[PDB]
Amino acid sequence: VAKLVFFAQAAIIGLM
Amino acid sequence: VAKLVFFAQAAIIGLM
Amino acid sequence: VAKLVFFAQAAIIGLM
Amino acid sequence: VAKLVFFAQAAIIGLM
Amino acid sequence: VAKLVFFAQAAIIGLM
Amino acid sequence: VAKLVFFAQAAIIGLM
Incomplete structure (x- = not known):
């Protein structure tokens, strides 16, 4: 998301 | 929360 | 934030 | 791995 | 462990 | 490190 x-x-899972 | x-x-501590 | x-x-970078 | x-x-991606 | x-x-759980 | x-x-701080 950066977050x-x-x-x-x-x-x-870590998504930006 | 899984978030x-x-x-x-x-x-x-990572909590769901 | 402690979240x-x-x-x-x-x-x-993890910010409290 | 759980580690x-x-x-x-x-x-x-955090894998066990 | 910082690590x-x-x-x-x-x-x-994340331990130092 | 990518680990x-x-x-x-x-x-x-997470370092690759």
Whole structure:
């Protein structure tokens, strides 16, 4: 987004 | 929440 | 913030 | 691995 | 450890 | 490094 938005699903994904 | 939320409690705790 | 807010731009910066 | 390992692939991928 | 070592267990813990 | 290495000292710094 830069901002890092973190999700977990297990892999962690940080999207910009 | 899964959206991962980070807290600096020191140890870092990532909460869902 | 203590909630952590992550930024990237390189290197990542987590600001409380 | 769980030990969390971070990769900057951009998106950040935390792998176990 | 400073170095942040990340573990997952689900909560993520980053220990110094 | 791209593997990410996190440091804290405040704010967190992730170095590739």
